[PDB]
Every structure is written in C-alpha cells, then in structure tokens.
Ligand binder design. Structure first.
Ligand SMILES: Oc1ccc(C(=C2CC[C@H]3CCCC[C@@H]3C2)c2ccc(O)cc2)cc1
Ligand SMILES: Oc1ccc(C(=C2CC[C@H]3CCCC[C@@H]3C2)c2ccc(O)cc2)cc1
Lengths: 9, 234, 229, 10
C-alpha cells in the first residue's frame, strides 16, 4: 500500500 | 527509546517544529458547485496526507512502533488529524472554516452541512477556551496514538503507546501549570480538551461514510492514497 | 441547579443510586448461532434497557435542568454509547466474553459484526487492567450523556466540570498521587473516544438490519435509530 | 410525535 510505502521511505 | 526520557519542554518543542505546513487550495473566485468544492477539498486533503505521514514520523515514540502498526494508526486517524487541524486553523474565523488561506468557506448537500456545523462548533469551542499551539500539538499527537491503540502474539507494546500517551498528558499539565492555572483548573481543562477528541472522532466517522458514498457515485474522484485510506474504514 | 451545589460525595451517591438494574434476556439455554435469533435477543434486551436509561438520565444531576428537547437530543446521541459502556462494564470479570445479560454470555465466535465485538472486548480488557471502580464508571457514563450531544450550553459544561472534580476526588481518596490522578483521568476519557467510535459503527450496523427487515424492531428503538440520520 | 417525548415526562 501507498501508506506502507511512504512510511517506509 | 528517545521518547519517555523526554522532558515536557523537550516534548513541546519537538511537536512544534514537526508541524506540517498550511497548504493552499486550487480555489478560483471566478470559477463556479458542491462537486467542484469536494474536488478542491479532495485534492487538498491528498496533499496534506503526504505531510501528515512525515509529521507522524517526527512524533516521539511513533517510529518505535512496527511498520504495520504505523499504517494502522494513520489509517484510523487521518481524517481526525485533518479535522482538528482544520478546526485549529479556523479558530480565528467565526462562522467560517479555513480549509486553506485562499479557501475560507461558510455554511452557505445536506448531511455535509451538519458536519460543517459540528466543525464550526468545535472551532468555536477552541476559541472560547483560548487553545494554545502547545496544547494543540499535544492533542493532535494524542489522536494519532490513541485512535488506533485498540483494533490492533504477545506482541505489544500497545503498551509503549500508553507510556507515551501518559507523557503527553504530563506535558499538557505542565503547560497549564505554566499558564498560572490552579490545580483544579488544570484537571478541568485537561478533561475539556480530551472530551473534544470524542467529538472529533464522531465528525470523522460521519465524514468517512460521506466520503464512501461520494466514492460509490464517482463525480468527484479520489486519489490513489486517499482511496486506500478510505478502504481501511470498510 | 442543585447539581453545582452538590459535593463530590453527594455527586457519587446520586449517580450510584440512579444506577439502572442489570436486566435479563429471554431465557431458554439455546445458544444463538443464527443472525435473527442473535439480534432478536439483543434488540429485546436493548429496548427494555432504554426504558431504564431514560429514567436513569432524569436522576443525573443537571440533566433535569435542561429543556425537554435538549434531554431528547442528548439521549438520542448517546443511547448506544451508554448501552455499550454498560455492557463493557458488565463484561470486565469475563475476559474474551461479553455479558449482555447474566443468562446471556457471548464470545467472539458468535459473530454473525465481529469487528465491533472485538472492539468491545478490547475496551473491557482495558477497564479490567485499569481496575475501573464503580464510582468511576457512573461518572464516565454521565459524561457520555452530557458530552455526546452538547452541540444554556454553559450549564452542561459546568456539570461536566463538576464530574471531573468528582473523578479526581475519587482518585485522591484511593491514595493516588498528583501525577497518577491526571494521568488516570486522561486514560479514562480517551476510552470515551473509542466508545464513540464503536457506537457510530454500531449505528450503521443497526441501519442495515433495519434495512433488511431481519428482526421486528420496536417503535422506540426505531425512533432512536432514526435520529442518527 | 416522538415516544421519547412522552417517556421523559413519565
Ligand atoms: O484539512 C482538511 C481538508 C479536508 C477535509 C475533509 C473534510 C472536511 C470538511 C467536510 C465537509 C463536508 C463533508 C466532508 C468534508 C471532509 C475532506 C474533504 C474531502 C476529502 O476528499 C477528504 C477529506 C478535512 C480537513
Ligand atoms: O437493537 C439493538 C440495539 C443495540 C444492540 C446492542 C449492540 C449493537 C450491535 C452489536 C454489535 C456487535 C456486538 C454487540 C453490539 C451491541 C446492544 C449493546 C449493549 C447492550 O447492553 C444491549 C444491546 C443490539 C441491538
């Protein structure tokens, strides 16, 4: 998910 | 953990300089509707989410959580955080909601007007209490950590979030004590602030179901991130 | 308004004596595994509880001072939150189980929503770990009654301040330190945000079954349900 | 026309 992506970056 | 060992003043300053900016909308006074309005708010909220995510990372104790936990906390409280921000910005504009410095709207589709009034009432509530920025950044952080502490093997800290929530509570009291408020007034004001969080929760829940119906009717389209945030409440 | 003149102990005794009874559900030991028998059992229970809640609200200090329309609005907004915080309270001594009635104890496997069911169990476990006292419970429930539909208005805020003083007074009597008081005060009030959440998700859950003619709902319960629309 | 009106007076 996008939220999971942005939180990880 | 960097948190918990933070003093009250260190907590405040950390929340203050972690504040997201106040973005502008695409509003044009010349251009004409409730459809284009929601499109303007959808585009605004989508750009606000990117700043909220990076804001959450700078919230003391938030990065101590697992990645799956961080996702859950934001998925549950993203509209609450947005709303308390909107309410905070509209604090000095009675009868108006300051979505953006170029988008200041008044009450003038039903159901959305009821939410609008509840947002105004909360804004009026903050104004009569003379809410401070130091208090606001604490309240917004509480929402981030509390709204999804339930609805989560042995797992857990959930238990660390509760530890940080206590720290923010101590911070709130420290602020009121520095404001010359008596020991009784501090407890009353603390209760007053946290009872408002129940209203913010309410407005968020009614906002979701309104956003869900808008989705299942097209017209005003939602971004990819905003769509996945919405599916989390379904 | 005599509520403002009341003392902390007078406030407690008033709320404790106003406590509605723990009602029983329809008997027969048949464990409900159907969706109709389940909700039919809960609708009948909730409807009977609503009658006691109304008369309970009257005996809440400051509530009688409001206009009739305000009393209606406040009850229309918080009736499910009050039912839930009562359910959660009764379910404390039974981990992983919800005590709707002494003869009606349900677990997570009875989900036929389970999401709201788990939220109620989580809230129950939280109360249990915090050792929520009865004096604290009746204060929280009163707050829900006055806070939920607070949107003249000063009076409610005055009584809400009075209950806050009552909560602190109870904690100070329990030997809690100055810091443990405002901390526990914060912990109790943050749960109210979750009770609100479960209530809202419960409403739309009750609108769907009403929009399906599953179980015959009472006229009173229908009017309470219709108010949230 | 609400039932809640009546019950709050009884
Ligand atoms: O800073 C903020 C920006 C946008 C929102 C948001 C709102 C708030 C205003 C109410 C008014 C009518 C019904 C829903 C909207 C939701 C909203 C609106 C449209 C969306 O697509 C997403 C969120 C809240 C705060
Ligand atoms: O018509 C009804 C009105 C309220 C209730 C009720 C609910 C609402 C829906 C379900 C959702 C998941 C499991 C428990 C709740 C309780 C409930 C909650 C607490 C009680 O003490 C009694 C009923 C059920 C039917």
């Amino acid at each position: 998910k996008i939220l999971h992506r942005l939180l990880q970056d | 953990s960097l948190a918990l060992s933070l003093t009250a003043d260190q907590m405040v300053s950390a929340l203050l300089d972690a504040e997201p900016p106040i973005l502008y909308s695409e509003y044009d006074p010349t251009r004409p509707s409730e459809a284009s309005m929601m499109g303007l708010l959808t585009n605004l909220a989508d750009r606000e989410l990117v700043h909220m995510i990076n804001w959450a990372k700078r919230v003391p104790g938030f990065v101590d959580l697992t990645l799956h936990d961080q996702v859950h906390l934001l998925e549950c409280a993203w509209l609450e955080i947005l709303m308390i921000g909107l309410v905070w910005r509209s604090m000095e504009h009675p009868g108006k909601l300051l979505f953006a410095p170029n988008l200041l709207l008044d009450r003038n589709v039903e159901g959305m007007v009821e939410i609008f009034d509840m947002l105004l009432a909360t804004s009026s509530r903050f104004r009569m209490m003379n809410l401070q920025g130091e208090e606001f950044v604490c309240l917004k952080s509480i929402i981030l950590l509390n709204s999804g502490v339930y609805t989560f093997k042995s797992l857990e800290e959930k238990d660390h979030i509760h530890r940080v929530l206590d720290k923010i509570t101590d911070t709130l009291i420290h602020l009121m004590a520095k404001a010359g408020l008596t020991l009784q007034q501090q407890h009353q004001r603390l209760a007053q602030l946290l009872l408002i969080l129940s209203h913010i929760r309410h407005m968020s829940n009614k906002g979701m179901e309104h956003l869900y119906s808008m989705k299942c009717k097209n017209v005003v389209p939602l971004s990819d991130l905003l769509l996945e945030m919405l599916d989390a409440h379904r």
